[PDB]
Each structure stands twice: as structure tokens, then as C-alpha cells.
């Protein structure tokens, strides 16, 4: 199937004392595999998946040097941005950056992205062409002119189309056992009386991977959105995900309702009904 490698970086300034709090995390699909936390003891990029631990010391030294360079760029950025927005030296502010690459079923480059945010709002983003920039406001327009002059998009396009995709293929091979395994949702239905004549039916999808899934209710074969509740997909904490969808029904009419589950791990979508 399709795959992605994504890195997420957050820095939060601490005006009272010291340098910004910095957290970097790397993912292959929905699996976290590396992390860096400026508050952690190691001061190194750390493994978070068994398949990355086999990488040699030149790998770890290189990733540590680059992630510490990212933290310093963010520290400088927080200063520049405070100036662009005429903000006080007293408030805490945040910079977020995410970049990465997607590959198709053939494991060839599909798309790349690089987005930057200041105080939780879009600041500057590389366009899908990997050549152009989307600047949200006039401060970002100043950055865009500097990035054009400094060949930033060319350096990113070379990384996203080359290095990013090459290492993603390497990780998918080394971590085959889990990364290329799809875990279809384990599904069941629960019934919760809300009175002596109505009940909630809850359709559960557990222990699935990747996180992408669709749970939909139907009544007599037509989609039902009235009296439904769908929770956001959530992590189980063991690398898999969970979700549920519920509908309130008149008691005795449960057989009209069907829950439909779509997931990459299912060749054909599942249909569940309440078993009285």
C-alpha cells in the first residue's frame, strides 16, 4: 500500500529563563520511530521503534547533529518573529514545522510537503510543485522573499524527492514485520438501554492499524446521521487505534440498523448488526 515519512518539530519560548522547550518526533505512517526532547537527559535523537535501533552510530550522530540544528533555527526564528509582529519579550510563543514525503503502492514519490506555523496559525508553506511558497501574511511575505533568494525550495525538493523517499523505502524494508502489516479492526456491537423503549447501539473498531478508518451507520440501507455520535480516532497506547460510532434507536427496532466499517486491512467492508 501507500506510505509516508513525516517529521514534526515544536519550539515554545520560555521568556522567564533559558532556551525554548523543543520537541521533535518522526513517524513512518502512524508509527513514531524517533524522538528528541530538549528536556530529556540524553540530548540525542532516540529510537522509539525496534527496527530503527539497528542503525549504526554514524546514523545516530548525524540525526542528533541535525535535530539540534533544527532546535537552534527555531530559537532564532522565535526571535525574528517576535520582531516581525512587534511582540513583547515577556510572552511565550510557539513555532511548529512539519515536513515529509508520501509514496504510492509502487513505493515511488507521490507528494512532498513542508509547512511552518507561528502561534498555531499558518505562516509559510511549500506549494505542491515543491518550487513555490504560500505566505499567509506580510511578515511571511518577507520570509518568502528571503527563501526565494536563498534557494530554500530547491534544497527541500531535493530532500523530499530523494533522501526522504530513499530512507522511507529503507525503513519499510527493515521494519517489514510491523510497518507493512495492516491490522484490520476487531469489531463488536454493544447495547445500552436509555429508557424502557430506546437504546444506544455502539459499534466498536479496536486494535487497528493504520489509523485511517470509516464507521458509518445505516437504517434500512440508507445512511443515518440523525441521533448518531462518532468519536475521534484515538490511540490504544500499544501502537494501534480505536474508534466507535453510536446511534439511539427505538427498542425492538435494532435489526434495521447496520454499522459499516471501511479499513485498508479489510478486503471487503464489514457490516455489523446487534445480536439480541
Amino acid at each position: 500500500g501507500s506510505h509516508s515519512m513525516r517529521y514534526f518539530f515544536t519550539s515554545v519560548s520560555r521568556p522567564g529563563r533559558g532556551e525554548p522547550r523543543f520537541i521533535a518526533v518522526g513517524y513512518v505512517d502512524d508509527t513514531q520511530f524517533v524522538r528528541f526532547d530538549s528536556d530529556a537527559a540524553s540530548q540525542r535523537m532516540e529510537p522509539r521503534a525496534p527496527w530503527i535501533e539497528q542503525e549504526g552510530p554514524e546514523y545516530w550522530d548525524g540525526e542528533t547533529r541535525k535535530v539540534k540544528a533544527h532546535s537552534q533555527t527555531h530559537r532564532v526564528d522565535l526571535g525574528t518573529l517576535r520582531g516581525y509582529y512587534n511582540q513583547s519579550e515577556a510572552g511565550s510563543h510557539t513555532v511548529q514545522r512539519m515536513y515529509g514525503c508520501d509514496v504510492g503502492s509502487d513505493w515511488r514519490f507521490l507528494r512532498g510537503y513542508h509547512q511552518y506555523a507561528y502561534d498555531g496559525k499558518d505562516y509559510i508553506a511549500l506549494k505542491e510543485d515543491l518550487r513555490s511558497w504560500t505566505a499567509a501574511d506580510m511578515a511571511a511575505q518577507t520570509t518568502k522573499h528571503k527563501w526565494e533568494a536563498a534557494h530554500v525550495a530547491e534544497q527541500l525538493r531535493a530532500y523530499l524527492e530523494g533522501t526522504c523517499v530513499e530512507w522511507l523505502r529503507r525503513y519499510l524494508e527493515n521494519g517489514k514485520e510491523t510497518l507493512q502489516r495492516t491490522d484490520a479492526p476487531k469489531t463488536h456491537m454493544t447495547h445500552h438501554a436509555v429508557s424502557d423503549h430506546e437504546a444506544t447501539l455502539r459499534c466498536w473498531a479496536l486494535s487497528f492499524y493504520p489509523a485511517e478508518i470509516t464507521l458509518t451507520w445505516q437504517r434500512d440501507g440508507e445512511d443515518q446521521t440523525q441521533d448518531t455520535e462518532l468519536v475521534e480516532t484515538r490511540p490504544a497506547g500499544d501502537g494501534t487505534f480505536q474508534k466507535w460510532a453510536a446511534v439511539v434507536v427505538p427498542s425492538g427496532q435494532e435489526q434495521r440498523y447496520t454499522c459499516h466499517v471501511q479499513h485498508e486491512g479489510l478486503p471487503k467492508p464489514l457490516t455489523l448488526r446487534w445480536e439480541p
Binding site: 546514523y59 533544527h70 518573529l81 528571503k146 530532500y159
Partner: peptide
């Protein structure tokens, strides 16, 4: 692997 790139905001 993370990017090795340079930029100034």
C-alpha cells in the same frame, strides 16, 4: 532521516 537544509526566517 531528517533534512539538512538552511534557511533564515
Amino acid at each position: 532521516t531528517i533534512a539538512d537544509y538552511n534557511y533564515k526566517l
